[PDB]
């Protein structure tokens with residue numbers, strides 16, 4: 001029933017744009033896009049087409065009832081000009097889970113991956129090769145039922161667009177607002193899926209953080225103020241735990257955590273090293289407060305595709321500014337992660353995580 | 358800064374559609390309202406032929422759900438006068454929604470007049486059979502062509518219209534499973550935002566699979582009854598203190614403040630015949646009240662279906678008969694009678710806004 005890469009239709013652009021000569025994340029797009037339509041006849045043939053507007057019926061359920069989901073992954077170009085995607089199978093898996101949660105049509109993950117490979121191959125010259133640059137890949141699946149009844153759509157659109165990017169200077173630390181009034185996601189909810197509806201409501205919360213002199217939001221959960229995420233990034237703490245053991249901890253996948261690809265990759269790398277405990281456990285502000293008083297915290301940071309690994313130096317909680325000594329500790333773990341990831345992403349070391357285009 | 362109705366651009370259709378049993382939200386009228394917002398502020402509002410939207414693939418409406426909507430009804434009286442039901446409350450709510458998603462503010466009375474003009478142009482689409490109306494669907498979306506999660510510098514406000522029939526005293530069954538969560542305290546379930554709806558589609562499919570028609574949304578360790586489908590919930594009973602009462606859950610974060618809900622509270626409070634309260638309702642209380650024969654009627658309220666009775670609730674594996682229909686339903690019938698008198702201009706009333 002899935003659309004097939006074997007049926008890919010291609011229309012080259014006749015309005016090719018000049019590439020960037022200052023890359024602002026997510027604002028510059030390449031010449032082509034993928035588009036696939038689904039209706040009562042199933043999936044149509046996939047097509048690579050020139051970058052262009054979507055035409056939607058004004059009642060489209062994508063716009064009224066948020067039948068929408070997305071992905072985000074990067075492709076990187078090595079010195080030899082070979083382009084490789086970073087662990088894209090995980091994004092495909094996550095995308096399909098999102099689709100099922102929103103009653104959107106199923107597709108074949110490898111068929112989509114091949115279509116995306118073909119699209120990036122067409123726009124290969126858009127993938128920059130300067131240090132710290134990449135191509136951001138944005139798949140999207142939206143419902144497209146022209147009806148105001150809240151219902152499973154009988155029509156949908158799957159499309160993929162591409163953006164050359166730089167950093168989002170990838171080792172500049174940030175300050176976080178930690179206010180329990182704002183709740184990103186709830187157990188039994190959809191916070192662990194990459195659905196559009198999870199993001200729009202955060203915009204005002206981010207504005208409030210800025211107003212309070214902070215740069216990003218630390219999302220707290222539950223009566224014990226668990227640290228869940230930071231902005232649109234997973235949170236990690238490298239510390240000596242209350243039992244005396246040095247560990248890297250991140251919250252477990254209990255429903256309010258988006259299971260990041262970078263997150264998983266950091267756990268995977270640190271487990272492979274075998275040099276300290278690597279654990280998924282709830283982290284509370286009580287534990288962090290005590291650990292900071294007792295000098296046991298080394299580094300705190302967010303993980304995610306767009307910004308990679310970002311250090312945190314301050315947390316504002318219950319009107320008090322908590323200094324986080326991440327930069328004082330190197331930040332050694334952060335720098336090590338960034339170096340090993342860069343070697344893999346740009347092909348300095350062969351690795352099964354990279355998917356060649 | 359707001360767009361002004363005085364600046365309205367009118368483009369009449371050259372291809373009118375053939376007019377219509379009306380199925381909710383699937384038939385559209387000939388025209389729509391469109392207004393764009395960008396760095397220069399609001400453009401001039403426009404009434405134009407119903408037509409597709411053209412959106413940049415990076416539009417923040419489609420990636421980060423920078424989208425909200427409204428729903429309200431216009432009614433045509435016997436003499437063809439068309440009137441909107443309490444539209445000021447929808448404009449108020451729409452603006453609260455806009456602020457919550459960092460979308461641009463607009464002047465509520467300017468939008469109302471633009472909407473009046475649109476309905477006037479499409480006045481012949483407003484049906485006048487008993488139980489029929491015109492459903493008005495305003496929408497505001499962010500339209501920033503950027504993958505950054507940020508306040509948009511572009512937005513689009515549009516309004517489409519649907520003639521509708523019934524949706525009106527046929528009772529429904531509800532699935533009440535605490536696994537399902539519509540909204541949480543500290544969330545945005547109390548705003549009419551697109552994001553609150555998409556996740557419910559799968560849950561509604563589970564309700565159907567279990568032989569029920571709609572979802573009774575439970576919340577909290579005490580299994581509070583919050584909402585029913587996309588409708589507010591009311592219970593008419595004799596409470597544990599022996600007092601006859603109409604109760605609906607309070608606006609404490611997980612309840613969408615319905616216009617019909619407020620109207621029912623206003624109406625019953627004005628009668629002064631029984632106690633009318635906003636208080637949480639738990640399954641424990643309902644189970645006990647059912648066993649003691651204290652429950653008279655349970656129903657949902659909302660624009661598309663008005664007031665709908667409930668006759669059954671499946672609470673996990675236990676099937677509960679709700680005696681609404683054996684009790685008249687006297688309250689539901691009275692509310693429906695009085696609202697009809699007001700909506701269709703039988704009785705002049707400040708709740709109605711003439712077109």
Ligand SMILES: CCCc1cc(=O)n2nc(NCc3ccc(Cl)cc3)c(C#N)c2[nH]1
Pocket residue numbers: 072168174216230231232233301302303304305306307308310311312504505506507
């Ligand atoms: C939703 C995926 C695309 C995307 C949008 C966006 O706005 N951001 N912002 C990010 N990082 C901001 C940030 C910096 C430091 C900390 Cl500790 C937390 C958040 C990311 C990423 N990655 C991202 N992605």
Ligand SMILES: CCCc1cc(=O)n2nc(NCc3ccc(Cl)cc3)c(C#N)c2[nH]1
Pocket residue numbers: 148149150428529571585586587588656657658659660661662663665666667
């Ligand atoms: C979200 C606004 C438009 C809209 C869509 C939709 O699907 N519905 N469904 C409704 N009612 C179903 C229902 C019937 C009985 C009970 Cl007890 C609960 C829900 C309504 C309405 N009103 C509506 N509106």
Ligand SMILES: *Cc1c(COP(=O)(O)O)cnc(C)c1O
Pocket residue numbers: 072194229231232233234258259260261262263303304305306
């Ligand atoms: C996308 C996302 C992440 C993790 O992203 P990866 O790029 O898969 O590592 C974490 N949290 C939130 C809220 C996200 O949207």
Ligand SMILES: *Cc1c(COP(=O)(O)O)cnc(C)c1O
Pocket residue numbers: 428549584586587588589613614615616617618658659660661
């Ligand atoms: C719109 C809405 C209501 C109330 O609707 P009114 O038509 O304003 O009475 C109640 N609950 C939910 C979930 C809604 O979307």
Ligand SMILES: [Cl-]
Pocket residue numbers: 087088089090352353
């Ligand atoms: Cl992998």
Ligand SMILES: [Cl-]
Pocket residue numbers: 192253255257259
């Ligand atoms: Cl998960």
Ligand SMILES: [Cl-]
Pocket residue numbers: 443444445446707708
């Ligand atoms: Cl009013």
Ligand SMILES: [Cl-]
Pocket residue numbers: 547608609610612614
């Ligand atoms: Cl409210």
